[PDB]
Amino acid sequence: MAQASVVANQLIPINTMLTLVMMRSEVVTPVGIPAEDIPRLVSMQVNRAVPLGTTLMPDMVKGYAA
């Protein structure tokens, strides 16, 4: 399996604006937001708390569409 996802590099509190320190690239299942998209996620808000190691999904990010 080759496709990497965005995963949380720290706990991301609810309603936090994302920064680059918060986002790592990992090959995980199920697949989340493509890791390719990390620079476009900066300053977008999360609508729930995202624990460390959690795969960031499209429905967790306010305003995200692809």
Residue numbers in the entry: 0 to 65
What's written in the study?
Briefly, we use the initial (unrefined) protein coordinates to construct the crystal unit cell (UC). The space between the protein molecules is filled with explicit solvent. The thus obtained UC is used as a simulation cell. The experimental SF data are automatically expanded to space group P1. Hence, the simulated UC is effectively treated as a (redefined) asymmetric unit. In this manner, structural variations can develop among all protein molecules in the simulated UC. However, deviations from the space-group symmetry remain small due to the restraining effect of the experimental SFs encoded in E xray. Specifically, the simulated unit cell containing N protein molecules can be viewed as an ensemble of N slightly distinct conformational species. Generally, our model can be viewed as a realistic representation of an individual unit cell, rather than the traditional ensemble-average representation of the crystal. Compared with the original structure, it shows a substantial improvement in R free (0.194 versus 0.261) as well as in the MolProbity score (96th versus 51st percentile).
